[PDB]
Design a protein around this ligand. Structure first.
Ligand SMILES: CC(=O)O[C@H]1C(=O)[C@@]2(C)[C@H]([C@H](OC(=O)c3ccccc3)[C@]3(O)C[C@H](OC(=O)[C@H](O)[C@@H](NC(=O)c4ccccc4)c4ccccc4)C(C)=C1C3(C)C)[C@]1(OC(C)=O)CO[C@@H]1C[C@@H]2O
Ligand SMILES: Nc1nc2c(ncn2[C@@H]2O[C@H](COP(=O)(O)OP(=O)(O)OP(=O)(O)O)[C@@H](O)[C@H]2O)c(=O)[nH]1
Ligand SMILES: Nc1ncnc2c1ncn2[C@@H]1O[C@H](COP(=O)(O)OP(=O)(O)NP(=O)(O)O)[C@@H](O)[C@H]1O
Ligand SMILES: Nc1nc2c(ncn2[C@@H]2O[C@H](COP(=O)(O)OP(=O)(O)O)[C@@H](O)[C@H]2O)c(=O)[nH]1
Ligand SMILES: [Mg+2]
Lengths: 389, 451, 433
């Protein structure tokens, strides 16, 4: 077996038309692997500072210095994970972010094909390498499935039948799976995107006090990739099978923001429970990865609470074992949503928690005064030590 | 008219209210059915004091009280008890399940659908009131209703009324003793509302009262009735200054003005000096000096924290009975010379004094002796930080593994609401550690110009 | 008004339910005809928790009785309290499950479940504010285990936000009455772990030990064991029906006892229990009840707590008593046996006090523990399960009713995962690397 490190990425977004028209001010600053946020109503106290692995300032589109270009993000996550998948190991992207955060742009990108998301670049690179390396001996097959999780019940997004609750089973060797989940082959990435649009049309969406169309459920797009090898014999062997998972996570809601009763509160509670369990398993896996990776001791196998939710149960193979993980969080850049943004950071801080310390914005006047005082002290000490004053 | 509205939330609040209203009815000669034979016998007077009772035309007296709970049991015990005819038939009881020791259940899910009725009744009481002074909220940390619903109620009251004072009596969890597994979560989560919205929060501890009721009042097996009676005596000592005459009279605003150096440190301790049994009431002079000294004894504190580990920032002494100002001055002078009692260097005065002529009453069937003098001391000090620090440690030991968390998130909260609250708690602790430090040596570093 | 719907399936469930309705009925003063002939007034205030009010000043329990054979219905009707129940709640068929879990879950119970759910829905729609459900059944049996699991699945589907207790009589090593116990036990606990908020652990060996050693009964019978289980069943929900100094609802127990969703298997106990003639020789006080509650031989699950650690414990006292004594005794128990309590919970003792004790005793107490030692009760079953599954000892009886070999493997895996989850907290430190 092997561990599975997790890459924590956070990205802002350039203002939108409504934001631009209004006089709203930005509130998020980002430098290196650190971000800081200022409370608009408490300018006096302090800014909250968090430190991630990967930090991306996509605020100023025409910026030339320290602009988080889309190709940069793709090279920094998706290329490495696709290479890992080609070696024959399962990999996964979680996409977290509340309404207005801008998760969809990062995950899919614009249809103009000038600014891409992670999914189109991954699919294009996969199929380019498939066509490039298809020699006489090697064969490649790709299949796609798209499911939805709602109130701890699985539903099919591609099959147009009645939205019944599918049954979750556990094959002894192939692990957890879902019965009657339609599985389809695809020849071009255009087919993949068409299927994605068709499934996204079928997502369970309800109107809230915040937005009229907010996702009420999780969604998983699995790309199943099979490599067949033809050695110099009569035996053709399916050498490895690997999975690429694209999980869309709904945000975390508060009952105060959405005071609706009945189905709405049930959906919110289920979403919060699933997100908490997902964070717990990811944190445990990151800790277990970090430990052996340096110490190389096998502390039994610990216990990873996979079964506490259907989401972590179905993604059991992808998360655990020899695999790769990466979570991307979108942070709206306005202020009106300040608390929301903070919550996102607090969810993106979870797992692989690392030390950030306090970021202090010094007054330039006091900085210059202190520097000049130090210079005067040094020069005076040098002069008086030699008896020249 | 100096008038206050008492709000009782949760089981602890309702039972403390039972004790308090027994004491008030005994104090003012009001019968359990609301009638006062004293006025009929004498002819008239002000014995229908407007602080706690509103008088109707027929001569009945209705308390200015609001009881709230999510269970029907504790209030159904009052609707069919001895005082069933004293209270207005409203009691604001949600005929549903309880908060179930869950802050989120009492603040988000089930706290709604009952807050509106409570606020409507509070507004109805306030409309009848002239010259309202403040609110007296009784609750308990560690409970579901008493934490979450109290937080919601305090937030809404601060939004609505704003300027009126809001005094809070609360039962902080004990260090070792407890009656629930998830006390730290609720107690920490209540920090937000008990900090920003309340004006002065008095904390009492069950372990301290058990210790008192075993060394002083020699009882070996106490129940909650004794604790509620002692707390009722404390509240009566606090509120006596706007019901009866006295040489020096202290209103509710003077309390806040004298005991609160900064807005964020309004957590004073409270103590009652002449806690003694009838048998030991003899063999004891019980002079002003003795009770004043006993107020400062660490053993007699109502919260398990040692004052010697901190510094006193303010004190407020409320005397009752045959007390003369000269003896109070002598006692304060004697206390100021002791070395074990350290005051912060930036508060040279450090004492508020109030004297009231009305002596304390004796509840029939009670445990306290009849005495001629009494004193209640409030002390804003830095030792309270210790009482918080232990709790924080406990919280960490449960939040590292995220135990019991899914119950809270299943009712409408999120994980972050934990951590934020903890951070806020840390800030409060640091604030105390900032204020108890002595002023830096020659606070203008050093000085001295030519001449 | 908190109210509870009671369900009883199978022979063991019906017997325990009948005894339970006789124990609760006395406490609340109910004539076997149904009229009220009590003395106190605190007995009718919360009568609606368990009873509906009929027209002619008569009270009918909310019991629902399920079976796949009419014999146990006939036994219950021809009994001391047979006429108390509503005859429309006697749901039953014929050609019983034959101690086959598949028949109870897939073939025979699938036809009677619709009628049982119709009755349950009719009963629950009349509730002012339904709190939760109770189900009494045996894991090692036929119709009981399968029908109970199928029902619990359906009600959890229909009422996801309501508590679901369960008093389960699971098999025991020495006192084994049927040869296919492990299959039924595994296939049942595969379902109970998913769709139940609280499960109480009972087995006949522990109750026999209590009868022989504590009560010194020469020839105990099933009536006694049911009498105990009934005592525990009332003591759990005493606080819902009566006032007290510090109340404790079912949801409070669930919140305070369950740290994580899958660890909800509890060890029940009751005190005081003496052997008639010894009564005069011992005084009744809070320390005596505390000592008897935590005694290993008093437990009703046949799992020694000394082999593990208590994740949580709850104590519901009934009687006039001092809160200081209760708190000091719980603190003393925690501080003395410090090795048997988990370190990362600062205080793991819930305490509740009810004012009015059981009729006949000045003091009583119920204990609900939650400890890692429960893993043993699963492990043994799993061992026996594999000892029968490697050779497929009686598998054709199950696969002939629509089941498949995969389901047994999923159930075994779920048992093993639950055992590991409970075992992770058992060891008394984690320092080395
Ligand atoms: C008169 C008296 O005080 O004698 C006791 C008595 O001697 C003892 C031995 C009783 C007696 O119990 C037994 O002998 C017994 C036999 C088999 C299984 C269980 C018990 C008693 O029968 C049990 C009986 O208990 C009750 O009456 C409670 O209400 C009890 N309910 C019933 O027993 C009951 C059964 C059928 C119909 C109606 C009531 C109860 C306890 C807890 C919660 C709810 C109900 C009492 C007081 C006694 C006797 C009569 C000897 C004991 O039982 C209980 C639960 O109290 C057994 O050890 C305890 C300790 C008691 O001291
Ligand atoms: N001093 C004192 N404390 C009490 C009394 N009753 C309850 N308490 C305290 O209350 C705590 C339990 O939480 P509660 O305040 O009762 O919670 P609640 O008000 O019943 O609200 P729920 O949790 O929803 O039931 C215990 O730890 C006690 O310390 C009392 O009569 N006197
Ligand atoms: N890096 C970026 N550069 C430029 N524009 C961006 C960037 N990120 C996001 N955007 C803008 O964000 C818009 C999409 O935002 P939107 O679809 O509302 O996010 P969202 O719907 O809240 N995500 P979600 O609801 O969680 O699926 C795009 O049309 C872009 O204009
Ligand atoms: N306590 C108790 N246990 C019983 C009783 N009858 C059967 N059992 C237990 O239940 C198991 C048999 O299950 P059974 O009742 O036949 O299940 P059913 O066929 O579905 O009703 C045995 O292992 C017994 O230990 C009873 O009257 N009381
Ligand atoms: Mg309560």
């Amino acid at each position: 077996m092997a561990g599975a490190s997790v890459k924590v990425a956070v990205r802002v977004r350039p203002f939108n038309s409504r934001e631009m028209s209004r006089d709203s001010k930005c509130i998020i600053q980002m430098s290196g692997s650190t971000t800081t946020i200022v409370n608009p109503k408490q300018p006096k106290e302090t800014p909250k500072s968090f430190s991630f692995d990967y930090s991306y300032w996509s605020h100023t589109s025409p910026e030339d210095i320290n602009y988080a270009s889309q190709k940069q993000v793709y090279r920094d996550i998706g290329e490495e994970m696709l290479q890992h998948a080609f070696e024959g190991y399962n990999v996964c992207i979680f996409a977290y972010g509340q309404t207005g955060a801008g998760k969809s742009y990062t995950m899919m990108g614009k249809q103009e094909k000038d600014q891409q998301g992670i999914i189109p670049q991954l699919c294009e690179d996969l199929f380019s390498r498939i066509n490039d390396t298809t020699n006489d001996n090697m064969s490649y097959s790709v299949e796609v499935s798209y499911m939805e999780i709602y109130c701890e019940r699985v539903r099919d997004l591609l099959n147009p039948k009645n939205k019944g609750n599918l049954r979750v089973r556990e094959h002894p060797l192939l692990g957890p799976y879902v019965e009657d989940l339609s599985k389809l082959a695809v020849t071009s990435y255009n087919d993949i995107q068409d299927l994605m649009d068709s499934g996204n049309k079928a997502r369970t969406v309800a109107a809230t006090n915040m937005n009229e169309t907010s996702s009420r459920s999780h969604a998983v797009f699995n790309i199943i990739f099979t490599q067949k090898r033809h050695d110099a014999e009569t035996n053709i062997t399916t050498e490895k099978v690997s999975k690429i998972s694209l999980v869309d996570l709904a945000g975390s809601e508060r009952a105060d923001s959405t005071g609706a009763k009945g189905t709405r509160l049930k959906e919110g509670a289920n979403i919060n429970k699933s997100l908490t369990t997902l964070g717990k398993v990811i944190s445990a896996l990151a800790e277990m990865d970090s430990g052996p990776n340096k110490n190389k001791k096998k502390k039994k196998t610990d216990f990873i609470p996979y079964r506490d939710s259907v989401l972590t149960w179905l993604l059991r193979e992808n998360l655990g074992g020899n695999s790769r993980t990466a979570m991307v969080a979108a942070l709206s850049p306005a202020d009106i949503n300040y608390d929301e943004t903070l919550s996102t950071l607090r969810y993106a801080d979870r797992a692989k928690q690392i030390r950030c310390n306090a970021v202090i914005n010094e007054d330039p006047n006091n900085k210059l005064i202190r520097e000049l005082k130090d210079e005067v002290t040094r020069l005076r000490d040098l002069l008086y030590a030699q008896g020249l004053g | 008219m100096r008038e206050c509205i008492s709000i009782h939330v949760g089981q602890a609040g309702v039972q403390i209210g039972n004790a308090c209203w027994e004491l008030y009815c005994l104090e003012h000669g009001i019968q359990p059915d609301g009638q006062m034979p004293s006025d009929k016998t004498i002819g008239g007077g002000d014995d229908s004091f407007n602080t706690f009772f509103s008088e109707t035309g027929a001569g009945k007296h209705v308390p200015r009280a609001v009881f709230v709970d999510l269970e029907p049991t504790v209030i159904d015990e009052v609707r069919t008890g001895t005082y069933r005819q004293l209270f207005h038939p409203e009691q604001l009881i949600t005929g549903k399940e309880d908060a179930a020791n869950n802050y989120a259940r009492g603040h988000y899910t089930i706290g709604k659908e009952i807050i509106d009725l409570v606020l409507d009744r509070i507004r109805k009481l306030a409309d009848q009131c002239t010259g309202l002074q403040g609110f007296l909220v009784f609750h308990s940390f560690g409970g579901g209703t008493g934490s979450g619903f109290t937080s919601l109620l305090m937030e809404r009251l601060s939004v609505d009324y704003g300027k009126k004072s809001k005094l809070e009596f609360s039962i902080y969890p004990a260090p070792q003793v407890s009656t629930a597994v998830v006390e730290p979560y609720n107690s920490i989560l209540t920090t937000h509302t008990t900090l920003e919205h309340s004006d002065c929060a008095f904390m009492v501890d069950n372990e301290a009262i058990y210790d008192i009721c075993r060394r002083n009042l020699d009882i070996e097996r106490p129940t909650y009735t004794n604790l509620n009676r002692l707390i009722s005596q404390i509240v009566s000592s606090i509120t006596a200054s706007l019901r009866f005459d006295g040489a020096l009279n202290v209103d509710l605003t003077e309390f806040q003005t004298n005991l609160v150096p900064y807005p964020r440190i309004h957590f004073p301790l409270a103590t009652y000096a002449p806690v003694i049994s009838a048998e030991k009431a003899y063999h004891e002079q019980l002079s002003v000096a003795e009770i004043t000294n006993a107020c400062f004894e660490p053993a007699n504190q109502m919260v398990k924290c040692d004052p010697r580990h901190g510094k006193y920032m303010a004190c407020c002494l409320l005397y009752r009975g045959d007390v003369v100002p000269k003896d109070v001055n002598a006692a304060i002078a004697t206390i100021k010379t002791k070395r074990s009692i350290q005051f912060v260097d930036w508060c040279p005065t450090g004492f508020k004094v109030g004297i009231n002529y009305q002596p304390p009453t004796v509840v029939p069937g009670g445990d306290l002796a009849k005495v001629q003098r009494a004193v209640c001391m409030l002390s804003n000090t830095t030792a309270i930080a210790e009482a918080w620090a232990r709790l924080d440690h406990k919280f960490d030991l449960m939040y590292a593994k995220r135990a019991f968390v899914h119950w809270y998130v299943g009712e409408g909260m999120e994980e972050g609401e934990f951590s934020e609250a903890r951070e806020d708690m840390a800030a409060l602790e640091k604030d105390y550690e900032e204020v108890g430090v002595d002023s830096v040596e020659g606070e203008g570093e050093e000085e001295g110009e030519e001449y | 008004m908190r109210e509870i719907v009671h369900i009883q399936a199978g022979q063991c469930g019906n017997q325990i339910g009948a005894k339970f309705w006789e124990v609760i009925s006395d406490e609340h003063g109910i004539d076997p005809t149904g009229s009220y002939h009590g003395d106190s007034d605190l007995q009718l205030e919360r009568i609606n928790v368990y009873y509906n009010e009929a027209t002619g000043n008569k009270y009918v329990p909310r019991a629902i009785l399920v079976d796949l054979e009419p014999g146990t219905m006939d036994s219950v009707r021809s009994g001391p309290f047979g006429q108390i129940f509503r005859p429309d709640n006697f749901v039953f068929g014929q050609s019983g499950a034959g101690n086959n879990w598949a028949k109870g879950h897939y073939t025979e119970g699938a036809e009677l479940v619709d009628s049982v759910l119709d009755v349950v829905r009719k009963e629950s729609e009349s509730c002012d504010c339904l709190q939760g459900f109770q189900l009494t059944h045996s894991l090692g049996g036929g119709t009981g285990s399968g029908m109970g699991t199928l029902l619990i699945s359906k009600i959890r589907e229909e009422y996801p936000d309501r508590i679901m207790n369960t008093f389960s009589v699971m098999p025991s090593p020495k006192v084994s009455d049927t040869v296919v116990e492990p299959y039924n036990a595994t296939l049942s606990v595969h379902q109970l772990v998913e769709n139940t908020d609280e499960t109480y652990c009972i087995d006949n060996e522990a109750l026999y030990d209590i009868c022989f050693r504590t009560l010194k009964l020469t020839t105990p019978t099933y009536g006694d064991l049911n009498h105990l289980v009934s005592a525990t069943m009332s003591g759990v929900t005493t606080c819902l029906r009566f006032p007290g100094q510090l109340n404790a609802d079912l949801r409070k127990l669930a919140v305070n006892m369950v740290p994580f969703p899958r660890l909800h298997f509890f060890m029940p106990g009751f005190a005081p229990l003496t052997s008639r003639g010894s009564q005069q020789y011992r005084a009744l006080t809070v320390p005596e009840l505390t000592q008897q509650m935590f005694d290993s031989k008093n437990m009703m699950a046949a799992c020694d707590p000394r082999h593990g650690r208590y994740l949580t414990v709850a104590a519901i006292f009934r009687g006039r008593m001092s809160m200081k004594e209760v708190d000091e005794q719980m603190l003393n128990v925690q501080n003395k046996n410090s090795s048997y309590f988990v370190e990362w919970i600062p205080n793991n003792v819930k305490t509740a006090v009810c004012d009015i004790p059981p009729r006949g005793l000045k003091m009583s107490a119920t204990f609900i523990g939650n400890s890692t030692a429960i893993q043993e009760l699963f492990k043994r079953i799993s061992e026996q399960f594999t000892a029968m599954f490697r050779r497929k000892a009686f598998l054709h009886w199950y696969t002939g009713e629509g089941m498949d070999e995969m389901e047994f493997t999923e159930a075994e895996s779920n048992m093993n995962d639950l055992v590991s989850e409970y075992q992770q907290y058992q060891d008394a430190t984690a320092d080395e690397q």
